[PDB]
Amino acid sequence: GSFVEMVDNLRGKSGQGYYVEMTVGSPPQTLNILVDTGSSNFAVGAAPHPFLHRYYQRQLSSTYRDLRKGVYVPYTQGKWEGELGTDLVSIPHGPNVTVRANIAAITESDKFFINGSNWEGILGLAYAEIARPDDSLEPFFDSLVKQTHVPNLFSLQLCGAGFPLNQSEVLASVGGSMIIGGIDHSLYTGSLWYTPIRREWYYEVIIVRVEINGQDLKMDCKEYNYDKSIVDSGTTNLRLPKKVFEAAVKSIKAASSTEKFPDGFWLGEQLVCWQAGTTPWNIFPVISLYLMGEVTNQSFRITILPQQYLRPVEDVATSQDDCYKFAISQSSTGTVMGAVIMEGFYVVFDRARKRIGFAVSACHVHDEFRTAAVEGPFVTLDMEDCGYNI
Numbered sequence: 001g002s003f004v005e006m007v008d009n010l011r012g013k014s015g016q017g018y019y020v021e022m023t024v025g026s027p028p029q030t031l032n033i034l035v036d037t038g039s040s041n042f043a044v045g046a047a048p049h050p051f052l053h054r055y056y057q058r059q060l061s062s063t064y065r066d067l068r069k070g071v072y073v074p075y076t077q078g079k080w081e082g083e084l085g086t087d088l089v090s091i092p093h094g095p096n097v098t099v100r101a102n103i104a105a106i107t108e109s110d111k112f113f114i115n116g117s118n119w120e121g122i123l124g125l126a127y128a129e130i131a132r133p134d135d136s137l138e139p140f141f142d143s144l145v146k147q148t149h150v151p152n153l154f155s156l157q158l159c160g161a162g163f164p165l166n167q168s169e170v171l172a173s174v175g176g177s178m179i180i181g182g183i184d185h186s187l188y189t190g191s192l193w194y195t196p197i198r199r200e201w202y203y204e205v206i207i208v209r210v211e212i213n214g215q216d217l218k219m220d221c222k223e224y225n226y227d228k229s230i231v232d233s234g235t236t237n238l239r240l241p242k243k244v245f246e247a248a249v250k251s252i253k254a255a256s257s258t259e260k261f262p263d264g265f266w267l268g269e270q271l272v273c274w275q276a277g278t279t280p281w282n283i284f285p286v287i288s289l290y291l292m293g294e295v296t297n298q299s300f301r302i303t304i305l306p307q308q309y310l311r312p313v314e315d316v317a318t319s320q321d322d323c324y325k326f327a328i329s330q331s332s333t334g335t336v337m338g339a340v341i342m343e344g345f346y347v348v349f350d351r352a353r354k355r356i357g358f359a360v361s362a363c364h365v366h367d368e369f370r371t372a373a374v375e376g377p378f379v380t381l382d383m384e385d386c387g388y389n390i
Ligand SMILES: COc1cccc(N2C[C@H]3C(=O)N(C)C(=N)N[C@@]3(c3cc(-c4cccc(C#N)c4)cs3)C2)n1
Pocket: 014, 015, 016, 017, 018, 036, 037, 038, 039, 040, 041, 042, 043, 073, 075, 076, 078, 112, 114, 122, 123, 124, 132, 232, 233, 234, 235, 236, 339
């Protein structure tokens, strides 16, 4: 590992998101910030809020600059509103540089800040095209690259614990690494396989085949990317298009049919529990997503285990049982490879070469019989047809 200063700089879990420490203003104001490859704004709480124990105080920063413009961001299941400006921003456990970046000072929000969550803002790492209010507001990473010599690439190792982490534990535990400007070889095993970034807005990719325990879901591959497929550290679950979700759940139920689970479990609403240590991992299937490779007619696959798609949750009776929620759910906005997918791999966002790399994560949860995997190559024809166009 050549980036020791950035290794283990993340904290959190899939259900609450993973965050990194950042500072804003002069003198520096420290804040915990959610790492989000699913958005492109750097936005931080800038006013008192019941669920925040600290926030950005613009009046105390000598380097604060008011852009005299507001921003309103309503998203499904939540929203935030704020005031735009710029200031000096740094990442203590990151590159040793300070950059002037845009900051959306959140003055009002709805279902944005979660009680128990330890972050006070979000770092949108995707492209300008989806920045709010529009693409003229340069994203943080673009500013970083333009103002310093930091390579146009970052990589993420999100580490799920495999069991519940209480309030004390989640604050005292290492949740992963965000390597800014490079690839740390200590974070993965095996080889890195790259899939092209289809278009630079979200980190869009193309899935060309899906298997449940080796059995081909056998759907027109266009269905897998309808209306798009993205890699999003800011989404907890692996989300699949309605029709794909229906087919996948049917296959996962069939593979695990030796035990019957309630509809609420499959809907991701209710937890299921087993006596301590007896979770029947082996009855659940592995899931393989084949992604377009960099070479013509070549693909590779990433395989996850139920240890990735069954999210550990504390039992309501805080018993000694091991409980989980099914972390695969349906979407009407395309496939979203969220945290439970990313927890199995070291993911390289190679913006410079317009590609995303995947390798087995050194911190993925597994058992003595199965492990997550990244394998290739496979001959796959007409992969462009798998991409959707409106
Ligand atoms: C910040 O600026 C902007 C701009 C436009 C949109 C935008 N966002 C759209 C939201 C969204 O719907 N997704 C999917 C996402 N990728 N990021 C957002 C949030 C995620 C969480 C959150 C909470 C808990 C856990 C996890 C996890 N894992 C994530 C809260 S808001 C921020 N942000």
